[PDB]
Amino acid sequence: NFCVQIIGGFFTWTPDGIPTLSNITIRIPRGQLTMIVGQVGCGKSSLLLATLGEMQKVSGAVFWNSN
Numbered sequence: 001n002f003c004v005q006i007i008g009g010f011f012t013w014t015p016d017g018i019p020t021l022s023n024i025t026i027r028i029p030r031g032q033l034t035m036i037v038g039q040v041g042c043g044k045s046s047l048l049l050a051t052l053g054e055m056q057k058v059s060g061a062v063f064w065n066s067n
């Protein structure tokens, strides 16, 4: 199974409302070198923090797993 398994990905920073991100569905398996590119401020650092759990997720089905 993919280690980074995200279905909803409704990331947010404000504890009440204000979703910082939504509709994020990524399934990245282990040993998959995936470089991320994008525009300035287009949910890069926020996505990285949400991957480690540093960002509040409102509606997201995440099942973290390893080998």
Ligand SMILES: Nc1ncnc2c1ncn2[C@@H]1O[C@H](COP(=O)(O)OP(=O)(O)OP(=O)(O)O)[C@@H](O)[C@H]1O
Pocket (backbone or CB within 6 Å): 013, 020, 039, 040, 041, 042, 043, 044, 045, 046, 047
């Ligand atoms: N912990 C946080 N709490 C609130 N807002 C945040 C937090 N972390 C990032 N943000 C903001 O949310 C947005 C997400 O942008 P993104 O994650 O792409 O930033 P970035 O990768 O640091 O951008 P840049 O290209 O400017 O370096 C930005 O406006 C950023 O300032």
